[PDB]
Amino acid sequence: SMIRTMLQGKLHRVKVTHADLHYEGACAIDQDFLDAAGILENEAIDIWNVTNGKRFSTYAIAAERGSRIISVNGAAAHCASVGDIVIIASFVTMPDEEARTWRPNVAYFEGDNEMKRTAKAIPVQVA
Amino acid sequence: SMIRTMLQGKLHRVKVTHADLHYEGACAIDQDFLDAAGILENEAIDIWNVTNGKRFSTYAIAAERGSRIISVNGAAAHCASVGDIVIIASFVTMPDEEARTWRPNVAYFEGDNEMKRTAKAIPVQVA
Amino acid sequence: SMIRTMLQGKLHRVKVTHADLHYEGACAIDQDFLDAAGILENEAIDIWNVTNGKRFSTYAIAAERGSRIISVNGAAAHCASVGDIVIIASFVTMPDEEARTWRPNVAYFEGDNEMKRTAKAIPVQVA
Amino acid sequence: SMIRTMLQGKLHRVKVTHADLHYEGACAIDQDFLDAAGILENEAIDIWNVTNGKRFSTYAIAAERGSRIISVNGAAAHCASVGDIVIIASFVTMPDEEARTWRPNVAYFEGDNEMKRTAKAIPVQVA
Amino acid sequence: MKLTIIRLEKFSDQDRIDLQKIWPEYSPSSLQVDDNHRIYAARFNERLLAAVRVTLSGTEGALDSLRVREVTRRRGVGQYLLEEVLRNNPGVSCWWMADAGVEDRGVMTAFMQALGFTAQQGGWEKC
Amino acid sequence: MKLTIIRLEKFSDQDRIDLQKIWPEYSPSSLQVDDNHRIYAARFNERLLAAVRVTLSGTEGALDSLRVREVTRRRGVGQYLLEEVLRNNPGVSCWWMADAGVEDRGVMTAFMQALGFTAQQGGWEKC
Amino acid sequence: MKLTIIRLEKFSDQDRIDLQKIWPEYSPSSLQVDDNHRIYAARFNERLLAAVRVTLSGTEGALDSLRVREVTRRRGVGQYLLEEVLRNNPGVSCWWMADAGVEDRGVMTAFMQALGFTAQQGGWEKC
Amino acid sequence: MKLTIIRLEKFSDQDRIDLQKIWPEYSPSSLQVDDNHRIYAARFNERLLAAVRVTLSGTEGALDSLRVREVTRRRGVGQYLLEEVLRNNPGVSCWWMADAGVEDRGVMTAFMQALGFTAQQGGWEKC
Ligand SMILES: CC(=O)SCCNC(=O)CCNC(=O)[C@H](O)C(C)(C)COP(=O)(O)OP(=O)(O)OC[C@H]1O[C@@H](n2cnc3c(N)ncnc32)[C@H](O)[C@@H]1OP(=O)(O)O
Ligand SMILES: CC(=O)SCCNC(=O)CCNC(=O)[C@H](O)C(C)(C)COP(=O)(O)OP(=O)(O)OC[C@H]1O[C@@H](n2cnc3c(N)ncnc32)[C@H](O)[C@@H]1OP(=O)(O)O
Ligand SMILES: CC(=O)SCCNC(=O)CCNC(=O)[C@H](O)C(C)(C)COP(=O)(O)OP(=O)(O)OC[C@H]1O[C@@H](n2cnc3c(N)ncnc32)[C@H](O)[C@@H]1OP(=O)(O)O
Ligand SMILES: CC(=O)SCCNC(=O)CCNC(=O)[C@H](O)C(C)(C)COP(=O)(O)OP(=O)(O)OC[C@H]1O[C@@H](n2cnc3c(N)ncnc32)[C@H](O)[C@@H]1OP(=O)(O)O
Ligand SMILES: [Mg+2]
Ligand SMILES: [Mg+2]
Ligand SMILES: [Mg+2]
Ligand SMILES: [Mg+2]
């Protein structure tokens, strides 16, 4: 019964499509993208901005399936601009025994939020 | 037994009423507001400042029911000023099965911390 | 089985006594102080600096009982100086039912880390 | 059933060997180093930079056993440079009873990521 | 912005695009608006998610063409739209909605019941 | 500031407003203060939450009009106020509080017992 | 960068070093590349992790020398390499891989089966 | 700095203060140090936590006055001190520690056993 915190899933290098201080809450994500990464509506997510270096935490809401929207909303819009490249992750906890065999849901994006690949593992970095 | 972190409830766009370095601990919140969002005295809360962009974590204490007070106290008063518009959230953990049907407690404010609406869901953002 | 994150205990307004980049890890705390706030050796703690506004997370190690030492060590020494006034907190998780009756371990300090008061509750802030 | 967050293990003062915005995710760590500190592939880790003061959270992936690689990848490469000295930690949760007897996995490094010592406890800081 | 009920007296081009999605069967502005023929709409993050037409005859009021976009159903939008219609026409003491156009009369009845309307031949009433 | 017990020798206008809430039945300054008739008050974040009157006769001391604001009861305020009164009048070896004005004699007795007073006809004693 | 399948027409010195590790038995450039003799490779963070040789004869195609570096096996690399080879040679309707050089024919068959190939005498086929 | 084993050939005033705490019974510098009479000490965050005296006679070596400060026992300090003494005197193939001065011979034996020494009359041996 030691409990680990494990990467559950990630959206790798999506582009912010909207950012507005006046919108409600706090990252709206195309439905299809959430499903691909196993991320739930109302789940806590971390956002890492490759364009500007900012790292912040918020929660996810749904955006219309097929819209390709990554909308960074409310206070979070201080942390990202339209066109920024971001990584979106969530994390779950599980017993150590399950953690040793866990495989995260990973989704890869190119161009205008076109989903290129889903996978269940990240390769090993070699010398 | 994978455990998710879910938005439990939020106070949406309250106004800071007091901020003082010399007060004890660390966000005092009108009792009625805590009840509306399901937030507990001594619970960890996250504060997102729409006015200035700062994101910080603290814990909630009670303020007198009906006072409308949002008091940002002690070290936290470096992160917010009187009149700032903030979002206050807490998060809970639950099994994945329960998380898929979870509904957060959400409260909406206007003007001088007048509670306008409580709800149990955030709509989908459409294109 | 919704699980809340609750303030477990806090050291309120202790003074940093040592800070050094070359020390190992990462906040050493007088034993008596840890006991007073229910904080454990190797437990994750959050540090809020009232003097300079910085908020960071680390873990606690023991310092010699009766020394009154608050030693901010290694990388953390970028976040605090000798003489800064800080609040040290830890957080625990428990079912909602237990959370509604939880009482945190709180310790109050004055002057040269003299423990003035321990208590089990924070009062309500009134108008 | 109060649950504590405990330091599980740490890599003490490793040197960043690679840092690149264009690499995927987000800290690649020599396999042997992960084993020494009990850290798992895909586990959430915190990174504290002694050289520049930055504190950020990410997740670990494997790098080739024996390479000695500490690769800080993607958005994280805004937070560290080649040659920076960092501490890498993970945290686990367990019941209070187990937490009182917990011993973390600690690994100490010198020179070019040469592992000098593993241990199960941090000494007490004395006056 | 957050979910808001508005009375539309003039339509932007965004409004026109949104109303076509909500009401594909109608061609704006076939839609007449004057003091007794009203259209209320639910607005969320600069888009309309739901609409209804309101006909007033002093103490009697008729509702037709209530529709919430499929993507955002069961998030409380329909209910809030109707409450704001009732609340903002406090002169009307008798309301009727005919069952015309309704996809799923079974769902509609459960909704109209939640709102306190009684099922009648050809419709629902609250009076 | 944190909860503090103070002896009030002069009253600000805030003090006057606070004492009216604590003691609606009395009109400040009907309230006489000299060296033998004292008022001690619990102060928390620039407001008074509780008060008591103290009459000294050398080794004998009388307490009356102990009241804690309803909103902040059972948070240890009453107990701390009384301990500070006892501690700061170490000349008094015999204390009396008459049961006059007491709302709920049952609650009062359990409180006075926690503090080590014995119930007697007409009051409580510690002597 | 993320895991990418590339057709190698020219080899850098890094490519040469990587191919020696993937294929110790071959000496680049003993390796001939023209329009009908191809080498596809899996690239991850500027290194090659796996390679295969492809011989095309219009609607027939042969695969040999499929190898994934031992350190990074069972992370989906082999599977992605093969899918990209199939996908990018959509003219080929019949594929063959001979069982030559294969370490562990049992593992190979389970892999080739996951990819939809049938085991045959001397090899695997998808056709 | 981290826990380090050092050979003390010269003593600072801090060293003198520390050695008095480790060895109240001895008066530095009653303590003779030359090439065959050594003192090794465990150092942690600029303080000594443990010491031992080493007498070398070529292939034979004697240990006396091993002591770890009470406050920091059972954190692996004693064990690391002894291993570094053995490791840094690889010429010695036979070690003796007499049981003189030992508080608790039962604890000492379990310690010396963990380190691979055999209990003998009057002492411990590894040889
Ligand atoms: C030209 C024309 O437009 S003709 C008119 C055509 N209109 C239609 O055909 C109606 C199509 N359906 C809809 O538009 C929507 O489904 C509506 C209006 C019935 C409901 O709107 P919603 O925003 O989805 O309902 P909302 O979430 O506010 O529901 C509130 C309450 O209604 C009830 N309810 C709503 N949908 C359902 C359902 N599918 N089953 C059971 N109860 C329901 C529940 O009590 C619900 O409360 P809960 O979520 O706490 O259980
Ligand atoms: C003009 C005039 O003012 S006339 C005088 C009128 N005064 C009154 O009528 C008294 C009204 N009541 C009060 O003011 C308060 O309830 C007091 C003074 C009795 C208690 O003050 P509090 O600040 O609420 O008590 P506090 O939390 O310090 O209690 C300490 C201990 O008292 C006991 N206690 C207090 N309230 C209760 C209760 N309601 N039931 C059981 N025990 C109690 C408990 O042991 C408690 O310790 P715990 O919380 O560890 O269990
Ligand atoms: C000169 C020359 O090169 S001669 C040719 C020599 N080549 C060889 O000897 C092959 C040596 N083995 C390898 O290179 C690798 O093990 C390969 C190519 C067989 C597999 O590559 P990998 O990248 O490890 O396989 P990958 O993870 O993509 O596997 C995909 C599916 O294959 C199957 N699979 C792969 N390995 C195994 C295994 N060891 N056991 C069971 N099934 C397996 C599984 O279904 C797997 O899906 P899963 O992980 O969802 O269960
Ligand atoms: C003038 C003079 O100085 S005269 C000499 C006087 N010296 C003494 O009287 C010795 C007093 N005791 C001590 O100094 C210490 O207790 C020592 C040296 C025995 C042990 O030092 P420590 O740093 O506390 O031991 P350390 O934690 O390194 O122990 C390593 C192993 O020893 C064993 N060990 C140590 N203490 C104990 C104990 N109290 N019970 C059982 N086993 C023990 C265990 O196997 C332990 O490994 P573990 O923690 O994985 O179980
Ligand atoms: Mg809805
Ligand atoms: Mg109280
Ligand atoms: Mg693989
Ligand atoms: Mg020790």
Residue numbers in the entry:
A (entry chain A), B (entry chain A), C (entry chain A), D (entry chain A): 0 to 126
E (entry chain B), F (entry chain B), G (entry chain B), H (entry chain B): 1 to 127
Sentences from the paper on this structure:
We have recently described an additional component in the pantothenate biosynthetic pathway, PanZ, which promotes the activation of the zymogen, PanD, to form aspartate α-decarboxylase (ADC) in a CoA-dependent manner. PanD (encoded by panD) is post-translationally modified to form its catalytically active form, ADC, by cleavage of the peptide backbone between residues Gly24 and Ser25, leading to the formation of a pyruvoyl cofactor from Ser25. The PanD-PanZ protein complex is a cross-shaped heterooctamer, with one PanZ molecule bound to each of the PanD protomer-protomer interfaces. In addition, we show that PanZ acts as a CoA-dependent inhibitor of ADC catalysis.
To confirm that the observed PanD(T57V) conformation when in complex with PanZ is solely caused by the protein-protein interaction rather than as a result of the site-directed mutation, we determined the structure of a second non-activatable mutant, PanD(S25A), in complex with PanZ.AcCoA. Diffraction data were collected at room temperature in-house to 2.1-Å resolution. The overall architecture and major protein-protein interactions were completely consistent between the two complexes (PanD(S25A)-PanZ and PanD(T57V)-PanZ). However, owing to the change in the available hydrogen-bonding interactions, slightly different conformations of the active-site loop were seen. Nevertheless, in both structures one of the two residues at the site of cleavage adopted a Ramachandran-disallowed conformation (Ramachandran et al., 1963), suggesting that the PanD activation region is forced into an unfavored and, therefore, high-energy conformation upon binding of PanZ. In the two uncleavable PanD site-directed mutants used in this study, the unfavorable nature of this adopted conformation is reflected by the formally disallowed peptide backbone angles observed for either PanD-Gly24 or Ser25. For both proteins, global fitting with a 1:1 binding model (Houtman et al., 2007) yielded robust estimates for dissociation constants of 35 ± 4 nM for the PanD(T57V)-PanZ.AcCoA interaction and 157 ± 5 nM for the PanD(S25A)-PanZ.AcCoA interaction.
